[model samples]
Target: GLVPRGSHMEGKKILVTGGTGQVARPVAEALAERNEVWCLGRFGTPGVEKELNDRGITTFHWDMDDPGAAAYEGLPDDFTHVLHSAVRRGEDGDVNAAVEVNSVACGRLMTHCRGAEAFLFVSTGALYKRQTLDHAYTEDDPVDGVADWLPAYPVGKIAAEGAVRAFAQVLNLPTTIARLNIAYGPGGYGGVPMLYFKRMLAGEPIPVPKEGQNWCSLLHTDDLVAHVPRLWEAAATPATLVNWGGDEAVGITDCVRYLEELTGVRARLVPSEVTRETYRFDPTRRREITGPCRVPWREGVRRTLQALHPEHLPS
Candidate 1:
C-alpha cells in the first residue's frame, strides 16, 4: 500500500535539484503528491516538467553552476527538505568535470540552503573500494581507492558526502547521504541494460562483458523516491549514511535474460575471457531505515519493461 498523504511530508516545502534527470523526475513526482514540491534545473522540457506540474509540482529555473545572485534569486527562504541530485556524468570520462559538478556544486548548494530541516544527497555505491570477495558493501566500507576510468565520479561523490557531513556537524543541519546502487525504471537514461535493449530491438548481436558472473544490484526509481520522507523524518544532527540496493543480487547474464523475456528480443550473450567484479550493497540498513521496498526486484523489472514497451504488455 502507498503511504498515506498528509501523514508524512505533508504541507512541507521540498526543493529538488536536477529535477529533470532520470531519478529526480520520479522523486519529485512522488513527493509532489504529498508535499509542496519545487524543482530546479537550468532547462525545463515540456514533457518532463509538464508531467511534474500536472502532478501539482512547481518548477524553478536555476543554473547550479553559477552560485551567485541568480541561483537563489527566487528560491524559498526556508524549505523543510532539500534533495541534491544534480550531477554531471562527463563525456570522455573527464574526472575533473565530475569533481567540479558533483563535489563543487554540492558544496555551493549546501552553503546556499543551510536552513533546510533535512538535506539528502544522492550518491552512488561506486565509492566502495574493490572488494576481496563477491559480497555486498556496507556504509562502513572504506572508500579509499579510486578507479581509473571514473575516478572523478566516486572521488567527487565521497568528497561531497564528506562536505555535507561536515556542514551538518558544524551548522547543526540534519543530513542523510544515500549511496544508491544502479537505479532503473521509466525515464532511465542510457545504461548497460538500455544499451543491450536497444541492440536487441534492432536485432543486433548482444556482446556480454567478460565478467558475466559479477552480481549487480538495482534499486527502482519509485522505491528510491519512496524513502525520501522516511529519511526526512529520521534525519539527525550528525548526519547518517545508508546503502540502498535491491533485496536480492542477480548476475549480469540473468538480467539480460530477463530483458529478453520481457522484450521478446533474441539476446545472445557473447562471452568474454576476462573477469571483473561489480559492486553490490547490503540493504539491511535501508530496510531498517525505511521499511520494505515498495516494489521488489521482480515487480520493478516488470513495471519498468512495461513502461518502456507498453504495447508489448498489458496495462
Candidate 2:
C-alpha cells in the first residue's frame, strides 16, 4: 500500500523544494493529494510549473543561487512541514561558490521555516567515502566529502548538512537528513539506468570495472513517496541522519544487461579500471523508519523504461 506510516497527514500546509526534480516531484504530487502542497523551484523547464499547478500544488519561483527575501516574498512561512531538496549543484566546477550558496541557502530556508513542525532535507549517499564495489554504507561510515564523478556535489552537500544540523538545534526544529542513494523512476530522464540505456542507443560502450561491478541501493519513486511522512515523523530537534535507500542492492552491470534484454538495445560492455560510481546503503535504519520497500528494483526499472522509452523496448 502507498499509505505513509504513522498517522497520515491531512489538511496541513507542506512546502516541498525541488518539486520538479525526479526525487521530489513524485513526493510533492503525492502529498498534494491530501494536503496543501507548495512547490518551490526555478521551474527552468517549460510547462513544468503549469504541470505542477494543475495538480493543485502552488508553485513558487525560487533560485538557490540567489536565495534572497524577494525570491521567497510570496511564499508563506507558516508551513507545517518542509522538504528541502532544491540544490545548487556546482556542475559548472566552482567549488567555493557551490559550497557557499548551498550552505547559506540552507540556513536561510531553515530560518524562514523555523516554525514548521518538521523539516526533511534531501541529501545524497555520494557523500560517503567509496569503499569496495558493493559496500553497503551505514550512517556511521565515514564521509570523506569526495565524489570523483562530481567533485563539488558531495563537498557542497557536506557543508549544507552542517548548516542544516546547526539550524535544527538553534531553532529547536525537528529535522531529518536523509542521505539518498540512486533514486530512479519513470520521470525526468528516468534516473541513472535510463542514462545508460541512452548511451547504448547511441552505440556507446558502457564502462565497467575490470574485476567487479558498481552497486547501489536503488530507491523507486513509489517507495520514496510512501516513506515521506514516516521520515518526517522520525525528525528530531538535533536532526536525524539516516542512509535512505531501497531494500535491494542492485549492480550497474547487471542492470544494464537487464535493460538490454528488455529493450533489445545492444550494450557494448567495455571493461576498464574506471568503474561507474555508485553507493549501496545498509537499509537497517531506513527499514525501521519507513518499513521495507514496496516496489522491487527490476519491476521499478521495467516500469520506468516502459513509461519513458517505449520505442526502444522489444516488441
Candidate 3:
C-alpha cells in the first residue's frame, strides 16, 4: 500500500532532483508510474539519461554547483511537487560545492518552482554530534557536528536545511526536511552499510572504530519508497523537520557480525585508535506520521548483500 492504489499525488507534476543517485533514483522511478516525474541532475554516467527517459521520466541537465544553470535554461514554470535529494559529498575540499549545491542551487530551484504546492528536502543524520552516549539524535538535537562524518557533511547539510527553511518562510511555501539515517537496500550505491558489505566481500578486516559499539538506524528503500506520502503530509508553511530511520537501532559490532552470518564469512574486527563515532536517531517523530518501517534491519541487510554479491549468497 505504498501508493494507496489511487493516490492523490498521482496526477501531479513532480520534480525529483538527484534522480541518478541511489536513494533518489528509486523514488523518481516509483513516482514516475503515477505522476509526471522530471529528473534533474548533471548526467555524467553514460546512458543514464536515456535509461530514465526510457522509463517515462524526463531528464534535466543541471549541476548543483551552478545555481542558475538549469533554471535559467527555462525549467518547467509550474511543478506541483518537488523533492530535493541531490548532494555532493567529500571532505574539507568539497566545502564549496557541498554548501552551494543545496544552499544556492536549491533556493534557485525553489524560486523557479515557487508555484509548487509542496516541497520535500532530504537531509542526513550526520548533522548530529558524534557523542559517546547511548542516546539517539532527536529532532531538536544540537546539529552542526563536523568531525566524525565527512568533514563538510554536517556543515553543508545544515546550510542546505537553512536554505530550505529561509525559502519556505519567504515564499510561504509548504516544505518538510527529512533527516535520513542509514538508507540501505539493493541498488544502494553510497551508504555506510554498502561500504561494510563491500569490505566483507573483499576479505578485508573491519575496524570497529570509536571504543565501544556505536549505534545507528538503517532505513531500507522498500520502507522509504512507501513512506513518501507521509513526508508530503508533514510539510507545512513554517517547514517541518522529521528524522527518518528504521524502528530497530543496532550497534556497529552486531551489524558486522550479522553480515558475516549472512555471507558465511568470518569478520576480523580490529578496534583501532582511529575513531569514527556515529550518531543514533530517534525515529519517534517520523513514525508518528510515516508509520513504522516494515522491513526489519536484518532482512534489509541480508537482501542488500544478496543484491551486491549474489555469488556469496549460498545456493
Clashes of each: 0, 0, 0
Task: Output the better candidate (1/2) by TM-score.
Answer: 2
Give candidate 2's error at residue 27 in angstroms.
Answer: 0.7
Model 2 segments beyond 4 Å from truth? 1-8
For model 3, what is the C-alpha lDDT against the true structure? 0.80
RMSD values, in order shown:
2.9, 1.8, 2.2
* TM-scores for the candidates: 0.87, 0.96, 0.92
Model 3 Cα RMSD, Å? 2.2
Q: Please give, for residues 1-315, the per-residue lDDT of candidate 1 as tens digits.
A: 555533455778888987888777777877787689998886545587677778998888877556455667766768878998887666556666666666667766776778888888888877788775357888898886466556667877877787788888877888888877777776655345566577777777655455536677777776677677887766777888888776778666777788777767677666665433367788888888888766666667767666676675533
Task: Name the regions of candidate 3 deviating beyond 4 angstroms.
Answer: 1-8, 69-71, 90-94, 209-211
Full-model lDDT, candidate 1: 0.73
Model 2 TM-score is 0.96
233-262, model 2: which lDDT tens digit per residue? 999989999999999989999999999889
Residue 53 CA error for candidate 2 (Å)? 0.7
